[PDB]
C-alpha cells in the first residue's frame, strides 16, 4: 500500500496548510483586536524579571554543571553565593514567620467567621510521631537543664583506576550470550531486511542489538536509531542501561522522548520511546527517512498499537526497497510473524537458564488460596533459600489472601519467622512497590503475591518458588449486545512458560503449578487471544482513518478485527459529527484525530465553544483518560477514605465529584500530603494533570480556547451529555435493552434516577453502570437526532 | 529490621508496656488527649464507679498477670482430684474432667435474682 503512504503524505501537507490557515486567522484576529515615572516602573519590572530569571537559571546551571581548578573555584563560589541568597530570603521569610507567629486572637465577626489557610508532613510521619510520643511519655529525667556539672570524666588509661572499571564494563558486555554470536547477528542483519531475531531471556538483546548495530554503522548518515517498547518503564530501563553502558547521559546521544518526559538535547543517536510516538511521527512523518535502522519490540505483549505498527512495517517493506528493520522476539512462536513478512528469516539466540521443573498437584481443586497456603507452609518447612512469587487475578481476593496469610503468620511466634508478603496492583502508590523491589532480609523468605504484573512487565530479584494457578481476567467485549464483560479466564501454556521463565530468571526455578500436568498440557490454553478479538477499536479507527487508510477492513494484518466492532465504530462516527454521508472524515474529523483521546471524548471538544464551558469539560476529558482507577481505599481504614470521598461528593454524577477533587487539588501545592489525607493515589492523577497540561498545549491545532462558564455546571453537564449520547439509560438502557445496575463506588449508588447516562459497561458481577451522570433527556434529543426516536 | 527477639523478652516490660507499640488502633490513638480527666469526669457522668480510672489497657497497656497465681492457687488446694472429691464429680460418671465445659421481651418484673445458677453451684 504505497499509494496509501503517498496519500497520507498529502494529508500531512494539507494538515500543514490548515495549520498555516489557522495561523493566518490567529494573526488576523491579533491585528484586528509621567514619562520618567513610566521609565522607572519599566526598569523596576524589567530588573525584577531579570533578577528572577537569573535566580532561576543560576542553580539550574549549577545542576547542569554537576550533571557533567578555576572552574572548581567558580563552582564553589557559585554554590556559596546561592547559599547566602537562600539564607537571605529565608531570613526575610523567617522575619515574616515570627511576625505572623504572635498571639493574634480571633476577631469577632458580623455573622459567620471566615476560614483561613493552614500544616505538617502527612504520609507516614504519624507512626514515628506516636513512637516518640510513647518514648516521651515513658522516658524521664530530673534536675534542671543545667545538670551536666560535677563530672570528673575519668578516661580509660588503656595499654601504652577508573580505566580498570571501564575494562570491567566491557568484560561485562563480553559476558553477554549475544557477544559470541554478534558476528552472525550482523551477518544476518546485512543479509535480510525483514529479519526476526528470537531469543530467550538473559541474552541482553534489547541493550546489545542497537549497540551491535551501532558498531555496524547503520546509523551513519544522521538517520538515527530508535528503540520502541510496550511500556515506558521498560523503555527507560533499556535507555538507562545503555546510557550507563556508554556513560552517555540522557538528552545526549542516548536520549528519550516519552509522554511528559522528552529529554533530547538535539544530539540524540539512540532515541527511546514507545509505540505511541511511532504513531505520532507517523502522524507527523510519512516514512522513517530520518531513521535508518530501528529495532522492533516483541509481539508477545500483543499491544494493539504494535499490531498496527506491524501492518505499517509491512507497508514500509512494500514502500521502501529496504529499511533493514529487525524484530526482537522472546519465544519460538515466530512462524506466523515469519510468514507475515513474506517468509521472513528467524535467527535463534540460546538463553542461559536453570532447572525449572514444573510441578503438579495430584488432585483437582477450585479454591487455590488455601491449598497454596498449605503448600507455602510446606515450603517454609522444607529448604530455606528463595523468594516466593504467588500469582492471583484480582485486588479484592489478593487482599483477602494477604489478610489470611498474615493471620497465619501472626498465629505463630518464633516458629514461622518473617515471611513478609506484598501485593501488586495497578491503582497503587509506588512506595510499597519500591518496598517490593527492596531486597529480602537474610532471615526472611519474602513473598510477593501478584497479579499479571510479574507475569508480563515485572521481573524482581531473588525469586525461586512460584505458585501459579494460570488465571487472569479478560475484558471480553461482545458487540452482539454491546456489553464489555470483564470475566476471569484460564491463562495460556506460553503464559505459564513465561511465568516459569520469571521463576527461573534468577536461580533454579520452583514453578509449582496449581493443577495437574494433564490439565497443563491439554485442558489449558496454548495461545492467548489478542486484544482485537476481545475488544473494539474505538480509539484507533479514527487514527487509522486519519493516517490515510480508507480500506480499513481491507487493510493487511495478522488477523482481522471483528466486523461488528468496525460497523458500530463507523455508525457511532456517523452519529458523531465526524463522518459525512460518504463515510469520510471532515475538517473536524481530522482535527479530532490531532489529539489522541477517543472521539466519544472528543465530542467534549466539539461541544466546547458551542456555548463555551470549554475549560471544565477539557479538564474532565483529561482526567477521565486515566489508566489506573482513582481513589485509594485499602484493606482496613475504610471509613476515613469513605468520609473523604463523601466530602468530595457533589450531585450530578461522579465526574463533578472528581472535578471537585482536581479543582481543590489545584491551589493545594499539588502535594502528596493532599492525596494521602484524601486517600487518592499520587501516581495516576499526577499523570492526569500532565494530560491536562498536554491537552492545554494541543488546543491551537483544533483552534479551541480555554473558555469557562464559571460554575454553570448544568451547562457543563449539557456539554457532557452532548458528548455522551450513545451511553445513556432510562432502570434500563434504551439502546442495549439491558437492565442497569449501579456500582457501589459510584457517587449516585443510592437514588436511582429516571434518566442517567454512563461512561463504561464493565460486567464484574452485575450489568454495572460505571461513571454515571444525571440527565433528563432534553438536550440528549438535541445531539444526534438521527440516532434518537420514540423518547 | 527489628526482629522478634529484640523486644521478645521485654514484651510486657515498661510502664507503657512495649507490646503497645505494635497495637492495631495506635495510629488513631495518637489523638486522644486528656483521657485521664475524661475518666475523672466520666465519674461525674456515669452513676457507677470505675476503680480503673488511673490506667488504660490501650495506652498504658496491661500491667500484670494472674494466671500463674491461678495455677498455684489450684496447686495449694490439694489438687484437682482433691477438689473433685469435695464436689459432686463422681456422681456425674464422666471418665474425665477435661471434657467438661461451663456455660425484645415484656414482663411484670425483670429485676429478679436468678436462682438457677446458684442452685447448680449448690
Amino acid at each position: 500500500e504505497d499509494e496509501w503512504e503517498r496519500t497520507e503524505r498529502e494529508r500531512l501537507q494539507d494538515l500543514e496548510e490548515r495549520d498555516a490557515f489557522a495561523e493566518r486567522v490567529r494573526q488576523r484576529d491579533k491585528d484586528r483586536t509621567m514619562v520618567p515615572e513610566l521609565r522607572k516602573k519599566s526598569r523596576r519590572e524589567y530588573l525584577a524579571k531579570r533578577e528572577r530569571e537569573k535566580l532561576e537559571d543560576l542553580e539550574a546551571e549549577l545542576a547542569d554543571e554537576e550533571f557533567l581548578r578555576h572552574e572548581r573555584q567558580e563552582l564553589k563560589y557559585k554554590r556559596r553565593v546561592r547559599d547566602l541568597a537562600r539564607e537571605y530570603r529565608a531570613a526575610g521569610e523567617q522575619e515574616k514567620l515570627e511576625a505572623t507567629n504572635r498571639y493574634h486572637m480571633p476577631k469577632e465577626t458580623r455573622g459567620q467567621p471566615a476560614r483561613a489557610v493552614d500544616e505538617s508532613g502527612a504520609p507516614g510521619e504519624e507512626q514515628r510521631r506516636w513512637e516518640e510520643a510513647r518514648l516521651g511519655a515513658a522516658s524521664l529525667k530530673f534536675g534542671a537543664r543545667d545538670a551536666a556539672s560535677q563530672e570528673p570524666k575519668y578516661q580509660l588509661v588503656l595499654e601504652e583506576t577508573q580505566a580498570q572499571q571501564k575494562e570491567s564494563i566491557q568484560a561485562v558486555r563480553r559476558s553477554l550470550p549475544v557477544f559470541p554470536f554478534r558476528e552472525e547477528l550482523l551477518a544476518a542483519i546485512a543479509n535480510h531486511q525483514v529479519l526476526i531475531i528470537e531469543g530467550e531471556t538473559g541474552s541482553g538483546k534489547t541493550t546489545q542489538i542497537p549497540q551491535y548495530l551501532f558498531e555496524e554503522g547503520y546509523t551513519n548518515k544522521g538517520m538515527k536509531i530508535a528503540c520502541t517498547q510496550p511500556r515506558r518503564v521498560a523503555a527507560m530501563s533499556v535507555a538507562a542501561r545503555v546510557a550507563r553502558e556508554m556513560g552517555v547521559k540522557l538528552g545526549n546521544e542516548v536520549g528519550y522522548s516519552i509522554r511528559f518526559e522528552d529529554c533530547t538535547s538535539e544530539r540524540t543517536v539512540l532515541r527511546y520511546m514507545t509505540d505511541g510516538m511511532l504513531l505520532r511521527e507517523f502522524l507527523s512523518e510519512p516514512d522513517l527517512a530520518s531513521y535508518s535502522v530501528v529495532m522492533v519490540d516483541e509481539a508477545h505483549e500483543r499491544t494493539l498499537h504494535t499490531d498496527i505498527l506491524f501492518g505499517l512495517i509491512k507497508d514500509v517493506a512494500r514502500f521502501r526497497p529496504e529499511l533493514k528493520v529487525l524484530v526482537a522476539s522472546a519465544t519460538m512462536d515466530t512462524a506466523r510473524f515469519s510468514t507475515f513478512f513474506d517468509d521472513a528469516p528467524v535467527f535463534r539466540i540460546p538463553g542461559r537458564r536453570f532447572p525449572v521443573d514444573i510441578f503438579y498437584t495430584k488432585a483437582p481443586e477450585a479454591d487455590y488460596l488455601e491449598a497454596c497456603v498449605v503448600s507455602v507452609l510446606q515450603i517454609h518447612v522444607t529448604q530455606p533459600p528463595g523468594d516466593i512469587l504467588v500469582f492471583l487475578t484480582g485486588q479484592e481476593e489478593i487482599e483477602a489472601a494477604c489478610e489470611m496469610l498474615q493471620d497465619r503468620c501472626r498465629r505463630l511466634g518464633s516458629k514461622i519467622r518473617e515471611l513478609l508478603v506484598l501485593p501488586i496492583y495497578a491503582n497503587l502508590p509506588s512506595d510499597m512497590q519500591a518496598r517490593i523491589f527492596q531486597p529480602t532480609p537474610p532471615g526472611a523468605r519474602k513473598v510477593v503475591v501478584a497479579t499479571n504484573i510479574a507475569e508480563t512487565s515485572l521481573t524482581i530479584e531473588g525469586i525461586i518458588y512460584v505458585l501459579d494457578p494460570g488465571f487472569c481476567k479478560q475484558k471480553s467485549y461482545n458487540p452482539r449486545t454491546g456489553m464489555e464483560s470483564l470475566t476471569v479466564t484460564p491463562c495460556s501454556k506460553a503464559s505459564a512458560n513465561q511465568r516459569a521463565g520469571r521463576a527461573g530468571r534468577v536461580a533454579a526455578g520452583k514453578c509449582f503449578r496449581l493443577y495437574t500436568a494433564w490439565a497443563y498440557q491439554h485442558e489449558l490454553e496454548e495461545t492467548t487471544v489478542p486484544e482485537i478479538q476481545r475488544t473494539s477499536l474505538g480509539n484507533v479507527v479514527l487514527l487509522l482513518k486519519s493516517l490515510g487508510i480508507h480500506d480499513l477492513m481491507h487493510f493487511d494484518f495478522l488477523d482481522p478485527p471483528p466486523y461488528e466492532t468496525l460497523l458500530l465504530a463507523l455508525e457511532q462516527l456517523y452519529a458523531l459529527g465526524a463522518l459525512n454521508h460518504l463515510g469520510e472524515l471532515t475538517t473536524s474529523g481530522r482535527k479530532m484525530a490531532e489529539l489522541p483521546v477517543d472521539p466519544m471524548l472528543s465530542k467534549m471538544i466539539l461541544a466546547s465553544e458551542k456555548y463555551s464551558c470549554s475549560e471544565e469539560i477539557l479538564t474532565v476529558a483529561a482526567m477521565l483518560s486515566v489508566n489506573n482507577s482513582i481513589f485509594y481505599r485499602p484493606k482496613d481504614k475504610v471509613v476515613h477514605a469513605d468520609n473523604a470521598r463523601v466530602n468530595f461528593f457533589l450531585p450530578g454524577g461522579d465526574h463533578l465529584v472528581l472535578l471537585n477533587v482536581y479543582t481543590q487539588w489545584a491551589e493545594s501545592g499539588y502535594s502528596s500530603q493532599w492525596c494521602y489525607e484524601n486517600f487518592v493515589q499520587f501516581r495516576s492523577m499526577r499523570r492526569a494533570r500532565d494530560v491536562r497540561e498536554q491537552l492545554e498545549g494541543l488546543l491551537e491545532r483544533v483552534e479551541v480556547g480555554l473558555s469557562s462558564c464559571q460554575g454553570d455546571y448544568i451547562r457543563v453537564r449539557k456539554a457532557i451529555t452532548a458528548g455522551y449520547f450513545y451511553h445513556t439509560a432510562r432502570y434500563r438502557t434504551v439502546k442495549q435493552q439491558q437492565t442497569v445496575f449501579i456500582h457501589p463506588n459510584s457517587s449516585l449508588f443510592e437514588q436511582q434516577p429516571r434518566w442517567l447516562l454512563y461512561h463504561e459497561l464493565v460486567l464484574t458481577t452485575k450489568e454495572f453502570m460505571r461513571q454515571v451522570l444525571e440527565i433528563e433527556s432534553s438536550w440528549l434529543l438535541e445531539v444526534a437526532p438521527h440516532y434518537y426516536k420514540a423518547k | 529490621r527489628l526482629t522478634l527477639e529484640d523486644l521478645e523478652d521485654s514484651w510486657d516490660r515498661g510502664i507503657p508496656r512495649i507490646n503497645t507499640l505494635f497495637q492495631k488502633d495506635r495510629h488513631t490513638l495518637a489523638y486522644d488527649k486528656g483521657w485521664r480527666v475524661r475518666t475523672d469526669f466520666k465519674q461525674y457522668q456515669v452513676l457507677k464507679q470505675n476503680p480503673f480510672w488511673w490506667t488504660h489497657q490501650r495506652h498504658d497497656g496491661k500491667l500484670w498477670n494472674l494466671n500463674n497465681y491461678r495455677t498455684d492457687m489450684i496447686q495449694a488446694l490439694g489438687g484437682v482430684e482433691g477438689i473433685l472429691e469435695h464436689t459432686l464429680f463422681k456422681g456425674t460418671y464422666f471418665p474425665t474432667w477435661e471434657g467438661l465445659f461451663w456455660e425484645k421481651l415484656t414482663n411484670a418484673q425483670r429485676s429478679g435474682l436468678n436462682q438457677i445458677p446458684n442452685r447448680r453451684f449448690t
Binding site: L158, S414 | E5, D9
Partner: peptide, 28 residues
Amino acid sequence: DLDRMLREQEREGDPMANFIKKNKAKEN
C-alpha cells in the same frame, strides 16, 4: 534459644567490647 542467649551476651553491656571500642577510639 542458645542463639538468643549468645546474642544477648554479645549485645549486652560487654566491658571487653567497651575496651575494644575505647582502644580503637584512642588509636584512631
